[PDB]
Amino acid sequence: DRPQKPFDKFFIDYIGPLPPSQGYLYVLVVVDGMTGFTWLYPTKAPSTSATVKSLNVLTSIAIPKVIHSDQGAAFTSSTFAEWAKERGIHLEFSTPYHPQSSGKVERKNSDIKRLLTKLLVGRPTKWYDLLPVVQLALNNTYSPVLKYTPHQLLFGIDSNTPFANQDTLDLTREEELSLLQE
Amino acid sequence: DRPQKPFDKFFIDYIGPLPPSQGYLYVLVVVDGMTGFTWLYPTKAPSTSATVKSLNVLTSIAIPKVIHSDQGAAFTSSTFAEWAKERGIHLEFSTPYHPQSSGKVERKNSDIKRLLTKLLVGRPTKWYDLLPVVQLALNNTYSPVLKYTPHQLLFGIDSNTPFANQDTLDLTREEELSLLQE
Amino acid sequence: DAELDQLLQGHYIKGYPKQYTYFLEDGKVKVSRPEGVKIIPPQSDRQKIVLQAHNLAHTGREATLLKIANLYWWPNMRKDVVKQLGRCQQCLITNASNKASGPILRPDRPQKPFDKFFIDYIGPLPPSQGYLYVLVVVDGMTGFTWLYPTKAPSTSATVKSLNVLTSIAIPKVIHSDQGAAFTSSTFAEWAKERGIHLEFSTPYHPQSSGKVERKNSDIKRLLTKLLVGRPTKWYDLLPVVQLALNNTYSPVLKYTPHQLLFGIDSNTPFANQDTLDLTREEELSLLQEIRTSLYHPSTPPASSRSWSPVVGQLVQERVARPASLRPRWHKPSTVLKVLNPRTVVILDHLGNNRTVSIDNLKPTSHQ
Amino acid sequence: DAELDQLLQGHYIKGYPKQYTYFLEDGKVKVSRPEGVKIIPPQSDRQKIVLQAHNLAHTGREATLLKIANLYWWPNMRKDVVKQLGRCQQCLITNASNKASGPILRPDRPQKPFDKFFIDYIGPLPPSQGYLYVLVVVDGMTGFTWLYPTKAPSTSATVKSLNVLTSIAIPKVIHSDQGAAFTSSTFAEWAKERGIHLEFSTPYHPQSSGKVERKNSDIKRLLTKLLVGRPTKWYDLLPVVQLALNNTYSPVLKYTPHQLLFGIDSNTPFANQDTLDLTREEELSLLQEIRTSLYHPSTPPASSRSWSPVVGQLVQERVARPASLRPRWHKPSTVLKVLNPRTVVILDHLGNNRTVSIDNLKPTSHQ
DNA sequence: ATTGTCATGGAATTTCGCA
DNA sequence: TGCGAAATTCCATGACA
DNA sequence: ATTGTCATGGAATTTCGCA
DNA sequence: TGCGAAATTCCATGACA
Ligand SMILES: Nc1c(C(=O)NCc2ccc(F)cc2F)c(=O)n(O)c2ncc(CCS(=O)(=O)CCN3CCOCC3)cc12
Ligand SMILES: Nc1c(C(=O)NCc2ccc(F)cc2F)c(=O)n(O)c2ncc(CCS(=O)(=O)CCN3CCOCC3)cc12
Ligand SMILES: [Mg+2]
Ligand SMILES: [Mg+2]
Ligand SMILES: [Mg+2]
Ligand SMILES: [Mg+2]
Ligand SMILES: [Mg+2]
Ligand SMILES: [Mg+2]
Ligand SMILES: [Zn+2]
Ligand SMILES: [Zn+2]
């Protein structure tokens, strides 16, 4: 059997709705299944249109063999199916109410949802400007299983912005208080 | 003694006043003393200004060592003397009431005055347009003394417009009648 | 399909080397080559495959093959690749040439003054006394130049200036580029009335007018020096520059344009007095031999990858003013006649006969 | 005067050959030379004579001497001629150079991706969806290119586009020409905030950005081909062209910019499957050796009349946008430091320290 | 149915002045 | 019959929209 | 304080297929 | 061990405002 490789499978899903930040409400999360590399695209809706518009930017850099997602409406539409067929992308869906990904991807999506919350508190409407630095952190996060960051696995080099001093990823007692009020 | 050469001496004089042709009344006649080559410049007055303006065009092509003329006001002015001194041109005047030139130049000026009259009749106000072709005729007129035209003596080549069939240079009985009426 | 059928059972087919194991896998004929296992597509599918690989980025020969070689193999792949490159219209009209033009010709200097005039316009220039352009007339034999300031590069301004110039002598030929002032019917009438043959440079090729173009450089270079630190009032300097350049020595000729035209200097500074004791007839005799013994350059060596035009060859003319994101070359055309190794007549992209320089041509690639 | 006095009575003076009869005629010292009788002016008058002959048409060495030689002679005339040529300010700033620049350097390819970005703007282009320009970002190591349509070549459009790009990785160095968008203080702040060193090309020398400039050619060439016969709606084609060029083989490298960046093709047509059985760690190991063994060109042979800069040499900087009839070169300046055989620092014509390319320099003639 | 040109200044080569 | 230096010639370089 | 680059297609060179 | 042809490499050419 062929060893798992980058671009073999992209896991996509929507995070939201979120507080409005410069007119955007959702975040399309794309994770490479092998490297754990993450792309974050802000959208205004969890729609096929917004998904195609954001994946057209990603698929102008690299095209995955397979795109995996849940049975969300934006992904099971006939428009999105034609979009994937036009690019030779096989669509693969998890069973409804049974989200299936991978251990690496599950933990990666966990880190994303937690890391988004830690920086949402205090500035819940300024996360659009922070999406660039969030991707850098996620893609330069040391993976304990593979002993390499997603950046190193994707490019085969060390990054010019290593993230040794990482955050707690847990809400401090003060951030926890200023969140229940929101 | 040095043999006579082109540009050694330019003989200048004014012909006019003439019937107005496109706003010009006079003709400044410049003849090279050695070759007999003739330049015709139309002016609006026999003034130092008009002479300098026309000789500036000629002296931008070739500068004579000596300019010969009669004691006309346009030539004996201090302005024209300074103009000649600035270009290293020696001024040389004939005695008043004793016009002195050369046999070749005298006969050349004769041909010019006669050739102008022959084409003035019938079209006395259209001679400005004819000055180009008059110079070609004068400068391609065979010289009996030197057995070479002024063009051949100046350039050392034959002209692309030879003038074998020349005019009578005499007024026909009909041109003579249409001139006394004018 | 039938051709590939015999290959699977071990039969030999010309073009397919026998020392390879041709097998079938997943319904596709494959082969175990040193680079790896490649799919051998049927003959009927190879044109579409080369087209898809080329159309990715409209790449040339090697960059297209390297795409196809990642998946497929068949006898003489580049032959099918080059076949599509020569049929891709977008590549033929957009790609740059990689063959230089042949070595330039050095046409013989006109034997006599006034045999051929080279005329051209300089401008637009800073407004001086209301004038913007300069008509430059260069005698091909002598280099003697006349300068005429005009308000526009128009036929009327050309006629008025040449009427003054032709007062001194009429030229056999007047050479000019194909600008509007010189190609107008009015200018042709003016030249025919005076028995002057109008010679025209090939379009968009100022090298052909190089005689007067090179004089333009000296005119502007001298005007620039005289105007250093002063406002660009160049109108009153045109007579100065005309006289200065006409009496300037050419270091390779050892003569000034004035000397080649008249055989004797006028009352200008540093006038040569060598022939002062000779007569005018002896001077013109010495002048006629000087005009014939003048140095003349020869055709330079051709570059190692030049091309020369052949009758019937497919060539493409450079687009004159190509718009943004538009091809730089016209569709292929055929060479009708080869006038010289640098000038040809082609069947134009509009259907006409066009006389063009090979500098504005490229040979259509892939024949 | 006293020097010439001894020469008339037969006494020898160094520089004047004895085998000539030096006499006096019309109050001027003369000599009978093979070319004819020439006037020997006193030492005190020779500077003015060379100046008058040169000022006729601001001619160079030989064309000036040929004027003086028509009348005068003295020991080492060209030495006095060259002395005036080097002191004529109008000639020094207007004349073209006759010495080519030294051979180009081929700087080492960046060892790793994201070590150095080359960025530049293309435009203006035909309005497409309201966009006029294209920000082009080329990774120096891989050639992998990102395209960003903008409405202006502004710092704000550069920052907004690079913020999206730097979401994937932060580069060590960003190289760019000295356009307004990249030299603004706002752009320097944006780069310092992210730990990016801004490297700037020498002014008016796009060769230094040749990495991204050469990619600009391929972008426009592909856009032209895709727009043949269609209206120039290039906005929707930027993603297509970006993906197409990033996956286009370089025939000399045998790899695509995508492959040099990722070590494996994505789901694009004709994807290479050679490393399908290797693991990702084995793939990256093979990729790291490929990135080091890439072909690298060498400095070409210097042309037969090139010049290399030396500290302290008088050089002149090319004028950027020379107005009509204005000099093409600045006044002479001194080479302060030679960074490489193609780059120097000079004491600017305004008094500043300017880092310039020798392509925009000429050595001041006559020392 | 038409075509490069030539001023420039260091370098290469020749010529000059003298023996 | 040859030397050193000056003079001449050579010619690559670049710009004429 | 900084530096040319590389797709292109005929040609030159090497390699392949076979004996 | 060498041949003819195909495959590969070479690299001058030109254009990126
Ligand atoms: N570009 C010109 C230069 C120039 O670049 N010089 C620079 C130059 C470059 C290289 C060279 F070695 C020499 C040189 F002078 C020029 O000098 N001069 O004088 C021109 N004069 C007229 C025109 C308009 C030509 S046109 O547009 O009128 C053609 C109309 N029709 C022709 C027939 O086909 C249909 C169209 C352009 C130029
Ligand atoms: N001409 C440009 C080309 C170009 O010609 N390419 C053609 C080209 C030619 C040769 C080559 F081998 C490569 C190449 F791309 C270009 O590509 N790009 O990208 C440019 N980009 C910006 C500017 C403005 C520069 S500027 O005016 O802003 C300078 C302001 N200050 C600087 C400091 O000193 C004070 C003035 C010009 C260009
Ligand atoms: Mg979902
Ligand atoms: Mg009088
Ligand atoms: Mg023109
Ligand atoms: Mg021109
Ligand atoms: Mg730029
Ligand atoms: Mg550029
Ligand atoms: Zn194509
Ligand atoms: Zn000067």
Author numbering:
A (entry chain B), B (entry chain B): 116 to 297
C (entry chain A), D (entry chain A): 9 to 375
Paper's wording?
Compound 6u has a methylsulfonyl-containing substituent at the 6-position; 6v has an extended morpholinoethylsulfonyl group, which we designed to mimic the MES (morpholinoethylsulfonic acid) buffer molecule in our PFV IN cocrystal structures, and 6w, which has the same 6-tethered phenylsulfonyl-containing substituent as 4f. Substituting the phenyl group of 4f with a more extended and bulkier morpholinoethylsulfonyl group (6v) caused a dramatic loss in potency against WT HIV-1 (267.9 ± 68.8 nM). Based on the crystal structure of 6v bound to the PFV intasome and the cryo-EM structure of 4f bound to the HIV-1 intasome, it is clear that the binding modes of compounds 6v and 4f are very similar. Therefore, the differences in potency are largely due to the differences in the 6-substituents and specifically the morpholine ring of 6v (which is extended by two additional carbons from the sulfonyl group) and the phenyl ring of 4f. The modification at the 6-position of 6v (MES group) had a similar trajectory as the 6-modification of 4f, although the modification on 6v occupied a greater portion of the substrate envelope. The sulfonyl group of 6v, like the modification on 4f, was intended to mimic the binding position of the molecule MES in the active site of the intasome; however, in the compound, it is in an inverted conformation relative to the binding of MES. When superimposed with the apo model, the bound MES group of 6v would clash with several water molecules (red dashed circles), suggesting that the binding of this compound might displace bound water molecules and potentially cause further structural rearrangements in this region. The more extended moiety on 6v would be expected to displace at least one additional water molecule and could displace as many as nine water molecules in total (red circles).
INSTIs selectively block the strand transfer (ST) reaction, which is the second step catalyzed by the viral enzyme integrase (IN) (after 3′-processing). INSTIs specifically bind at the active site of IN when it is engaged with a viral DNA end. The generalized INSTI pharmacophore comprises two key elements: a metal chelating scaffold, optimized to bind a pair of Mg2+ ions in the IN active site, and a halobenzyl side chain, connected to the core by a flexible linker, which binds to viral DNA. Previous X-ray crystal structures of our INSTIs bound to the active site of the prototype foamy virus (PFV) IN in a complex with viral DNA (intasome) were instrumental in guiding our design and development of compounds that are broadly effective against IN mutants. However, recent cryo-EM structures of compounds 4c, 4d, and 4f bound to HIV-1 intasomes revealed crucial differences in the binding of these compounds to the IN active sites in PFV and HIV-1 intasomes.
